[PDB]
Symmetry: D2
Subunit: 442 residues, 4 copies
């Protein structure tokens, strides 16, 4: 937990010096740590995942210098916000900077000119097209666009998905609002400190790590299906009515199960492995629930159907699926390539090809600044998958939304559209008779 002792590079201060030299980061900045970048961070960075969270603030009481100051303080409190991402010596790494001055990009618009249209212009015109996270310049930056009277302002926060996740992003907002409202905040832990905790929980002799033994056992016997080799990102949507969840059964479990029966039909298998997304926050850590970073992980989820004389109800799969999740809670946090390297005979660089992600997170957002201020949320976002298929479930109050995201070369529009409906129809089926033997709908 002593700084610079997880660096894969030995003169870390000299990599700092060079970025400064190159005017890639501020030259008055200090290097307060240097750690490996995680697999899940790289997943995002490699997919150009980049957000611009925008807050349209209207009202007479807005304090502009305080807005500016809040940005600085937000960054002082969250070291993930002070982090540069770089590859050095074949190592993907993150650099924690301190003594970091935040400078807001400001725009005083012409009369009648819409603040948001200006942001959308900066965004489309240079902000994401020239995005180069691995060049080492901070992804996290602020923009202030104000009509002339300052009674209609848009504040934006740009950030790489390597720096937040669904559980902690709301904490970024409430922190910001609290800092602007002058509400004292409790001290917090860094994403770096999560990394060090991951590492302290590991044995130096891998064959003695309960985690990598659990995975070796969880996965012994198993074979993961591999798509036959495969140009734009495609998002495809299907809404259903929110399905009834028998006691003990998580909505996530439903989706993970409905996918497994889909994959059992289409593969010739009763032993399917596919990727799903875990929050990575089931560690014995202080602040684990609140710290800001990307502790999300993408891990193997094995669903196993019985020989077949066994007359499984839907419910039998439901409980089994859940167990194939909950079994791994204390082991869900390791690097995916580690699991492959230590618990399997699979190439460690083996990619997941399908990734199921249920969104049991906040689906609406809030930034309650005080005077009276109307504050409205919107975002811009990029996300470009490689060869994998993402299935996203969003549990709203009116609907579950099945979302498929994949490159068109991996899954064409009609394939995407069918996969949506197939997964939905099964979720529904599981909901309409959890009792039925698995002899359904296809």
């Amino acid at each position: 937990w002593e700084p610079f002792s997880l660096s894969p590079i030995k003169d870390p201060q000299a990599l700092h010096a060079a970025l400064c030299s190159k005017n890639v980061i501020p030259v008055t900045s200090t290097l307060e740590d240097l750690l490996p970048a995680t697999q899940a961070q790289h997943v995002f960075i490699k997919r150009g995942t980049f957000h611009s969270y925008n807050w349209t603030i209207k009202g007479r009481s807005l304090n502009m210098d305080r807005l500016r100051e809040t940005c600085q303080s937000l960054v002082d409190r969250h070291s993930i916000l002070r982090t540069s991402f770089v590859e050095h010596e074949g190592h993907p790494i993150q650099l924690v900077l301190a003594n970091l001055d935040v400078k807001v990009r400001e725009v005083q618009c012409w009369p009648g000119e819409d603040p948001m249209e200006v942001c959308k212009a900066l965004w489309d015109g240079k902000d994401w097209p020239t995005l180069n996270v691995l060049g080492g310049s901070l992804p996290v930056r602020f923009t202030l666009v104000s009509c002339p009277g300052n009674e209609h302002v848009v504040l934006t926060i740009q950030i790489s998905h390597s720096q937040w996740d669904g559980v902690s992003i709301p904490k970024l907002f409430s922190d910001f609002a609290a800092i602007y409202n002058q509400t004292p905040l409790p001290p917090t832990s860094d994403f770096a400190h999560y990394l060090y905790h991951r590492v302290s929980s590991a044995r130096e002799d891998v064959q003695q790590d309960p985690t990598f033994q659990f995975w070796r056992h969880y996965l012994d016997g198993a074979k993961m299906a591999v798509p036959f080799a495969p140009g734009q990102t495609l998002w495809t949507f299907k809404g259903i009515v929110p399905p009834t969840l028998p006691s003990g059964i998580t909505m996530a479990t439903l989706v993970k199960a409905a996918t497994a029966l889909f994959l059992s039909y289409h593969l010739g298998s009763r032993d399917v492995v596919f990727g799903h997304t875990v929050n990575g926050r089931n560690l014995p850590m202080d602040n684990i629930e609140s710290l800001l970073g990307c502790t999300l992980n993408f891990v193997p989820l094995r669903v196993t159907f019985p020989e077949d004389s066994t007359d499984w109800t839907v419910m039998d799969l439901l409980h089994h699926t859940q167990t194939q999740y909950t079994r791994a809670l204390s082991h869900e946090h390791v690097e995916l390539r580690d699991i492959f390297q230590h618990s399997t005979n699979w190439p460690a660089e083996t990619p997941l090809s399908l990734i199921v992600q249920h969104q049991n997170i906040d689906l609406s957002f809030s930034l309650p600044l005080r005077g009276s201020l109307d504050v409205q949320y919107s975002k811009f976002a990029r996300f470009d998958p490689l060869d994998e298929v993402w299935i996203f479930t969003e549990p709203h109050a009116d609907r579950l939304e099945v979302q498929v995201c994949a490159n068109s070369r991996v899954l064409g529009q009609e394939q995407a559209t069918e996969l949506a409906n197939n997964i939905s129809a099964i979720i529904t089926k599981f909901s309409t008779d959890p009792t039925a033997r698995l002899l359904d709908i296809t």
Copy 2:
């Protein structure tokens, strides 16, 4: 075994008389039998499988009136060549005609004009674009195209793949040559007789039926993978050095096992079902081996891998594959939709989605007409698969040739090309160390 004993319609001699008035068949023809069209026959008809077998004849000794006579003689001999195909009362059926006068289409070319070029023009111009087998006009027809001296003549025989297969097509040529050479031929059984023999061979009760008992146990607890969502017929080729065959092993086994390993990686299955072509000539009747028609069958082939605690050599697989074939010999001749209806849960109209066909048949062809004459073979062919992928293998002297044929929407050129290279690669690996245990591919 009486005629019409297998007709699924009740007035056969009136469907006949209907066709004659629509001028679909010769009015002076007689209807001798009427039977169900085989499932595999329909496979080809549905795919517009149509050949023009072309014989280029050069020499001074040619008897034109004898060539014409021989065409007629050949049709009197083989009833499948006297068969019209129609659909009626929801039923796919085949009408056997007699008192059928064979009329040749004849072309007297201009000096300098190439008869083959004329053939090609009629082929691409009308013959195959207007092809409508199920309308009920005879698929089998002859064309004679002559340079003015009758010393360069192309003879042409058209035919649906529903009326021949790989083993019996040479019989058609050899008989043709015998007839023209006035060489006496022995009595031959008809394709119909083949069908009457399948019925006699079966019991009226189905679980009772040992063939459907053997499949039920062959396919018990088996799951056959189903491709995701369903352009142009694309043919794709890769030829390798003819692999060496360990003692006991057929080339067909080497290919079938290479496909199973391939599908076991991609499906993450130890239990793979896929389609494959059998000659369907293991029934014991007289002339089974020599009768003209399509007795090809497409049937499930199941390959089962053990846990790798067993540690299979390649050889263990080869032997298992071969055995998963040889087991079904006495049962391989039944309708596929019957196998599904009677031995499985599976929907009976379940399509094979992959079909592996090893061409252990004649690959070169001869028509030794006598005077001296030069007689050269060539062909025109149509074939348009549906949603399935065919893998064909041709064991020539200088190369094993792997050939993939599928619609481009089912499998795109880049993929097809990879499939070809991959299967070839596994075949080749199987050949250079049959003893190796399962690793390394591909």
Copy 3:
């Protein structure tokens, strides 16, 4: 005469060279050897190629006689025995003799339509491999029969370098006559036409009344030139058959409409453009009934006077007709000769707009007769692919005058071609309706 117009020293050793490559029959003789006209090379360069098809249904039909008719008709029309070649880039006619005609014959399956067979041969090989300047004989016969020979198709293939509108019906009346052994008059070779054209030429050109006419005719004229420009397009617009003012011909009315279209677009009061003439005003004998391509494509100059002169449609009309009638005696000479002898223009200057009024037979016959009675219907297959030029064809049927524009899509796009056809249509009809109007027409 023969061979006096041969642009090669050894004709017989070009014929032998061809016989030796199996381009023409080995038993054939070379009987004349002349230049192909400029008009002939126009059609050849555009791959202009026709299959004239006769559907014959009936009991009394004599296949053997049909075959002989083919041979004899070719016998009497030397253009039908002509093969085309280039030798020093300047295409020539080899007239053949001792020419055995061999019909291509098809006996169809029962049920097989004979026309579909012909059509398949046409698209499958006959035109796609056409190579007239290779030397093989363009004129060739096909006979496709249903098995009882009571329904046949006869097809005559031919290059447009071997026929024109006025003489094609002769080919049909001759065929029918030969078959019925009805007696026929004697007739002239197309080659006779060529010889006659030259006979009337002056041995030196600045003296030739023809090239003197053309010099005066085009004196002052500038012919407009398209700016730089891949499929042949045909575009049609039918209008009510126009009323013709007294003395004014239909063709004149079409050509005046165009002239006016052009003067407006060019902002010119003196337009020159191409138009087709029949080339059969030469006073030779049997001029109007021989068989070949006597067509010529020549300049038509239309000069509008200043606006103070106050011209009526009628004035434009008479002048237009006059600008045609004036050239009758001189319209038969090579265009490239008109240019180099009578003007300042490059000899190889192409005509870029060609107006052709079809004042010829538009429907045809083959009264084969038969010993019960033969029913013979006409139809045809045709290729024609313009180069950089635009054609305007008018077609005067009973119920419509069909304005036809043909031109490569790269030259005149579909929507322009539609506008051209419509505009020319409108001007015409507008002329018909009020011939006394002043040239203050609305139109565009």
Copy 4:
């Protein structure tokens, strides 16, 4: 004087309507209201829109003074405070007064480029949403800065209906002068120009010498008319440089260009009497400061070139002299509306458009805005989308004469445009190399 020429009964209720829609500032006055000229309306229908970009790199820069220079300049030039609209069918200028200029300002991130930002705004919203006839003031300023104000890009946006080649350098020199607080000799409106044109015109139109000159000038003429051509289509620019032409004694570079075209046209049209469009500066009116006032006084008028019959044996020199006087003859008459030329002096439809316009760029091709020491570099962004017409522009740089062709790809395909540029180019060179040649000449 003000509100003369106003083609609407109630001008101030049109300024009212605009203000109560926040199209223009509520606190602004309607100082004048006039017709928009035909040439102005040409540029507007074609979306002609410029951003003039000054990159200032230096120590001494005064940001507050920059803002104010913006204000003063707009005060000085009434065309800069003009808004454009279409009422009663026809497009008109509203001149505004008591108009406060609001500069758009951007303080960039560290290491973020000012110009990349302007560019982003330009393509992101500035031109794609342009709507001049909607009434918003097309003239508007932008200042984008690096965080120490030692690096700034000022931009000026403007419609081509507000400037032309002779007066744009004035805009720049006036700005610098204001910035530097160098005093300035007063100037006239663009509005002054309009009021003058009406003053010098006669009221019985058949009595106006201008329209008698044009009637006589175009007497007997027919202008050729394009055929169609249609197919959307893209604006193409095509360039061909040639060696700067040696000029024959007494002949200008512009005559050289227009004679080449005439010769090109007479050949393709097969015509000895050709009429085509060409651009005049419109600054020959005798008026105070005609040469300095800021606006678009440009006009597009007929140039008629008449070749005699061959027996006359014209030389290239004859064509050059004739062509030049076909221009100098019209100098005093060049300032009237094209549509008025056609209505009053010909029998051609008044709304007849020119289909070919030649414009010789005998104006400044480089620019300046000179303010420790400030380094001030020029660049620009620009839109322009022609309709059915073809433009030919010639640009007389030191190393090359640039023949530029502009026309929608539907009117002239890339291939034709390239050939046009090469043909005209080649004719110019030929004329230059052998001006005594007879017009019966080779390539």
